[PDB]
């Protein structure tokens, strides 16, 4: 379907968009006490894999799944909350602020770099077709 460069750069754009979405969702839920069921929000992470279609030669980036972080959930002593345990510590998400801003900046700069790569390739693509005519 897609040309190889198109597929690689578009996969890069989609992967960076997914990472930015995960960062934004984490930054929104930084102060959430409960979900829809009664469990604390867990910071999400996105794992980049190389989609090496040929044997070890090249390939874009794919995202296998969005994993839930395994870090000590923040404990805040609020015994009056219905979600407090026997000891009374309500669970707050493990979303760090600085890491998510850094992730947003890095995802934006990778997105823009891949956009520039596509823009650069495009002129050569259109100029290839003048070879025959």
């Amino acid at each position: 379907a897609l040309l190889n460069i198109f597929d690689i750069a578009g996969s890069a754009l989609a992967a960076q968009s997914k990472r930015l979405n995960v960062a934004a969702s984490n930054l929104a839920n930084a102060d959430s006490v409960t979900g829809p069921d009664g469990q604390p929000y867990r910071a999400k992470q996105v794992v980049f894999q190389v989609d090496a279609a040929p044997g070890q030669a090249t390939g874009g980036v794919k995202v296998a799944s969005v994993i839930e972080s395994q870090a000590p959930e923040k404990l805040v002593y609020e015994p009056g909350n219905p979600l407090a345990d026997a000891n009374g510590y309500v669970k707050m998400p493990n979303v760090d602020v600085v890491g998510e801003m850094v992730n947003t900046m890095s995802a934006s700069r990778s997105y823009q770099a891949n956009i520039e790569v596509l823009n650069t390739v495009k002129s050569m693509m259109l100029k290839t077709l003048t070879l025959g005519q």
Binding site: N4, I5, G55, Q56
Partner: peptide, 13 residues
């Protein structure tokens, strides 16, 4: 060969 060209159709068929 091992590397497909940039202007080739997606290696993934």
């Amino acid at each position: 060969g091992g590397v497909p060209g940039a202007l080739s159709n997606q290696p993934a068929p």
